[PDB]
Chain A
Amino acid sequence: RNQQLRALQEECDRKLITLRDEVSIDLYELEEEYYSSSS
């Protein structure tokens, strides 16, 4: 069961990292976008 729930968090953790990855991309995808504004 422990091992079972281990997977339950393990992949989840990976998912979070994946999220971060996606977020990171999104992050970068907006950073250059922040440059454009000549305010």
Chain B
Amino acid sequence: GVNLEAFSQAISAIQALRSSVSRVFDCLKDGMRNKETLEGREKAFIANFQDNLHSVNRDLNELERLSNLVGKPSENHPLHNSGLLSLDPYSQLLQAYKWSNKLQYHAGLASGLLNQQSLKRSANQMTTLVLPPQYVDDVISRIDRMFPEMSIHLSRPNGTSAMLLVTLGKVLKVIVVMRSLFIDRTIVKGYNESVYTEDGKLDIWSKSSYQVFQKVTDHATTALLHYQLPQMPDVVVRSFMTWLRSYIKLFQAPCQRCGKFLQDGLPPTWRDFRTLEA
């Protein structure tokens, strides 16, 4: 697994294991300059001694470590070394192996700091923001279905615009009827109250529920109207899907008791809590 990175911290740990004892003897390198207030200075010595206990903690750190070992030792890395002398002038690639990573890592910061944009204007510098091809919808559908344990379906019986339905662990399916590219004008229900497979005769609208999911529907509409980025509609629908995923539990109830109202949910901050409080 990825627990190997934990060993990195362990490295720093044993580093202190050295420094600690140095900080001990350095503290013994000189005596009382001028206490004049108390004799805790000597205790200060023992204070450094206390940090030596940290070393024992290092031994404890190995209890959580050693999850399991992976097969095929050496992880296909030194296979290039098995080549003849002709292959040895190849380490460069391995360097790039880190470099590329750094690249990503650099972007990992850069893109992050790209969040604070400076686009004083976005028009009068040019188009067709509505996606022409009726194939990018299927692309977005497949990208969403790439997510596990969350099934998505779509029929689009109305026309050019997009129509889709999504289901989760509960029967709280969500019907989203939006334009070509970005999600807008959706609704949610629960327990066959919509039944948008063959409701009456087709995927009906019915604009209703028993006064429980209505707040969730309004919040999802707000999230759709708020996450409408100027570009990258795929990012928009992915953010929408991630937001929708946050209701798969409906179990916790922080910053209040589980008796304030019918339910509780408003996670635009990537964390749900008691509703009617933000």
A residues near B (Cβ < 8 Å) are 14, 17-18, 20-21, 24-25, 28
Contacts and interface: CB of A to CB of B under 8 A. Distances in A.
A25 B158 CA distance: 16
Contacts of A21: 159-161
Interface of B: 130, 158-161
A28 B130 contact: yes
User: Could you tell me the dominant secondary structure of chain A's interface residues?
Assistant: helix
A8 B160 CA distance: 20
B230 to A, nearest CB: 13
The 4 A-B pairs at the shortest CB distance, nearest first, are namely A21-B160, A17-B159, A21-B159, A28-B130
Contacts, number: 15
A1 to B, nearest CB: 24
B159 A18 contact: yes
User: Could you tell me the dominant secondary structure of chain B's interface residues?
Assistant: loop
B184 to A, nearest CB: 13
Contacts of B161: 21, 24
Contacts of A28: 130
A24 B181 CA distance: 14
Contacts of B160: 17-18, 20-21, 24
A39 B124 CA distance: 18
7 contacts: A17-B158, A17-B159, A17-B160, A20-B160, A21-B159, A24-B160, A24-B161
A27 to B, nearest CB: 11
**By CB atoms of chain A within 10 A, which of B130, B158, B159 has the most?**
B159
B159 A20 contact: yes
A14 to B, nearest CB: 8
A10 B161 CA distance: 18
A21 B159 CA distance: 8
Nearest to A21: B160
A16 to B, nearest CB: 9
Contacts of A20: 159-160
Contacts of A17: 158-160
A25 B131 CA distance: 11
Contacts of B158: 17
A30 to B, nearest CB: 13
A20 B158 CA distance: 11
A31 to B, nearest CB: 12
Contacts of B130: 25, 28
A28 to B, nearest CB: 7
A18 B134 CA distance: 13
B201 to A, nearest CB: 15
A11 to B, nearest CB: 13
Given A17-B158, A20-B160, A21-B159, 9 more contacts: A14-B159, A17-B159, A17-B160, A18-B159, A21-B161, A24-B160, A24-B161, A25-B130, A28-B130
A14 B157 CA distance: 10
Nearest to B129: A28
B182 to A, nearest CB: 12
